[PDB]
């Protein structure tokens, strides 16, 4: 309708994909409480990559942010596991775990282990 | 499967329907909001993390998106009860809400005691959400009342899942499509249904879609609405404690 | 009213039907929960709450929750459209979702622009819910098709209640249940329907309860689902305002 | 069965009305960040009596109790229009309101003051 | 002695407790006292600023509205106090027992008025 | 010259690639690389603790799962890599494309010879 469209042809700004991957991730580094080798040791980057994501924002299409999208897969389980409470959901991944034989953060180190800290935390969604 | 051997399953294969209940996270959207500044942006990063999830089966695509996700996301190492982590995932669900909220506590009680230390905050407030949904099978298989209640006692064994897990991979070669089995975890002997297809569903929306607080101690799971005023319905950790540790497949 | 004495009030009284949705607060129960230890004592601490709200009237108490929540609050002191502080309060909703996201939305600005300093975070994310309902009454009005329609700018005037607050005085002697009326919020001219007694509905259960995530900054009010995937519903303040001010019957 | 009742009764507990009220007061109080003395002049007590309801509870049915619980309904209002975002709900109280004609914390300092602002928030959820 | 503001209200709502038919437990319940304090106030005052004095003063501006509601009568004044209303869910009286039904029952008779 | 760990995985996966009918960019969408790296991993070599690195070795475990699986029939194993299953909901490739569906893969092979 007339008006309906002049503040929704008002309110429209597109984002870009690449930005929103590279603000999602430093806001999930450190509401995890990560350092960012801790961060560069999960997505395969060095600290200057890290930096440069908010000139250019880190690539989706990439591999690098393939796993950067796994990471923010695995503060989503944590959160929605946790009820949002974050001493919690940091505790999870400093501590040794029984299931997953490891610290979960240390097993993130690695590309098969980040899946299997990621799958434990899917599977026990959509249980609860 | 010696059980599908044994008890003759094709001779039993018949028509099966009933409705399902089951619980879900309803809080992952609210995460995704937390790293984000508006809600466009929130929109374009889930579909940014949907593209890097499991690959949804082909027959499950048109369904609703909470009649779905269970068959695009695979369970756990140990695998589930009737389906192992290599196979396609079953759709699990309770046929009655009060035995959902039972097999949705123990699970509470699994990530708990997965940590070698306890949570530090030893309240963990979670919000949940409950649907039920129609089915019906032409295929259908009823593992609590006739030959394989004679297995029934190994088919709700606490911490083995191998005779199940051989059974359901029985079933699903013999083309059973749901099956109905008697629950491991809820005190009241309630009986669970699995979904091997998607096409078991009869309606096209998740009903009666209610919003649940619940609330995780070392001693006890409790649900109550959060939208209309309730008393809790507890779930203590002896519901599921032999001896003093938490069974599970290890 | 003179309206209602103009537009053949009491002739055009008819017997209407329809479907109604509407939009609530959601996070009612997990405030309670913080100021207190146990889901037990969250339950009973809201029993106590419950206890100092207004008396819920008598025809009202066998309706769900959701239902009946809306006759025992009272309105603003400036009272609703067709309803003033000191008389029973009306249940007001829209006929289609958009319209009642649009009601909503301006109502998100109220309480924003009723702070002489803006809210410091510039952003609020809250979270409701949205319900569907069925509705029929034996008497009912349409203020938009026939002589009412004539008087319809007055009534969905953006700033003063006081012509469309005597007509609801009028119709409710006259024994009229529910009416329609358009919406003066809505953008794309959607009709609103209230209810002066409980006894319109037709079920008593809340249909398709939908959970769904807002965000309210100084430039828009913007919704979208908590529970499936879904691009946001933006509501921007320049459908509410005139000059640079938010209306409202001061 | 017997099963969840006996784990339900040595599970259960029967928490005190008066030590719920005394403790949900309190907590909102300090998430609402009002000084001892802001709560007396909203309740009717002196701080005296305040440090009193840690060990003997705070009436329900006296109207010291009242006006405690239209207080946590007020903070239970303001929780859910905002969000739980506190920085939002103690800004409300603290700055004038054009609506409310006056702070609102302050006209919480009287009865009728007190009712009107909780009135008011009451009125605009069920509108959004 | 000489005038104060306490010996004023006090003395005002207990010329609100008869005309109005209203028991040292009801008027407790509107004020917030135990009956004690109701009849200490005769000698000592009810201290205006306090949290009662201010349910107080509600309390004598509700038995106003009902004076030039009914002219003065109190066949009818009692009346309305006590027989439920619809326009109120409840009788009147059961209502100023809560701070907000008092608050509620005030606003309504200032409108009818 | 002398052997070391980045040139040991380089082998190691290029005799994967070639076996398995593995275009340069069929290969480049499973260990995340532009066919920039792919011809200097013949001179220089993979870098065995990069990211990279990780995905190439889970490329090298399928392979080696395959051959186990098949008798070493390099028939056998292109058909089931791009022939689509039904207990893996695609095509096993495809599924390799992205990195859980790339452990999902080795996983699943790992399963079927897990009893055998």
Same mark, same amino acid.
């Given at each position: 309708a007339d008006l309906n469209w002049i503040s929704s042809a008002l309110i429209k700004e597109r984002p870009s994909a690449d930005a929103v991957l590279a603000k999602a991730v430093l806001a999930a580094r450190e509401q995890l409480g990560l350092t960012q080798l801790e961060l560069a040791g999960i997505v395969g980057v060095d600290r200057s990559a890290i930096s440069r994501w908010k000139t250019q924002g880190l690539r989706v299409d990439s591999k690098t942010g393939e796993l950067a999208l796994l990471l923010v897969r695995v503060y989503r389980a944590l959160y929605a596991l946790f009820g949002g409470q974050q001493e919690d959901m940091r505790h999870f991944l400093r501590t040794p775990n029984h299931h997953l034989a490891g610290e979960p953060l240390a097993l993130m180190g690695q590309v098969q282990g980040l899946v299997h800290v990621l799958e434990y935390l899917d599977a026990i969604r959509g249980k609860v | 499967s010696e059980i599908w051997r044994q008890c003759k399953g094709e001779r039993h294969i018949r028509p099966l329907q009933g409705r399902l209940v089951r619980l879900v996270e309803s809080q992952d959207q609210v995460a995704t909001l937390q790293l984000v500044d508006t809600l466009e942006e929130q929109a374009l990063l889930e579909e940014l993390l949907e593209s890097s999830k499991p690959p949804v089966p082909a027959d499950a695509e048109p369904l609703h998106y909470l009649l779905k996700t269970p068959f695009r996301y695979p369970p756990l190492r140990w695998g589930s009860r009737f389906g192992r982590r290599h196979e396609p995932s079953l759709f699990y669900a309770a046929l009655k809400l009060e035995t959902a909220m039972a097999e949705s506590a123990y699970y509470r009680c699994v990530l708990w005691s997965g940590? =070698? =230390?306890? &949570?530090?905050?030893?309240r963990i407030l979670s919000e949940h959400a409950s649907f039920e949904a129609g089915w019906k099978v032409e295929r259908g298989i009823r593992?609590? *009342?006739? &030959?394989?209640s004679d297995h029934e006692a190994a088919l709700t064994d606490? *911490?083995?899942?191998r005779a199940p897990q051989e059974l359901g991979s029985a079933m699903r070669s013999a083309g059973v499509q749901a099956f109905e089995y008697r629950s491991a975890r809820c005190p009241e002997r309630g009986c669970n249904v699995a979904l091997f297809?998607? *096409? *078991?569903?009869?309606?096209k929306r998740p009903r009666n879609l209610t919003p649940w607080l619940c609330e995780t101690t070392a001693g006890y799971v409790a649900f109550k609405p959060a939208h209309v005023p309730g008393s809790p319905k507890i779930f203590s950790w002896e519901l599921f404690l032999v001896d003093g540790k938490l069974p599970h497949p290890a």
């Open positions: - | 940590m =070698v =230390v306890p &949570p530090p905050s030893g593992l609590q *009342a006739p &030959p394989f606490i *911490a083995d899942y297809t998607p *096409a *078991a569903f009869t309606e």
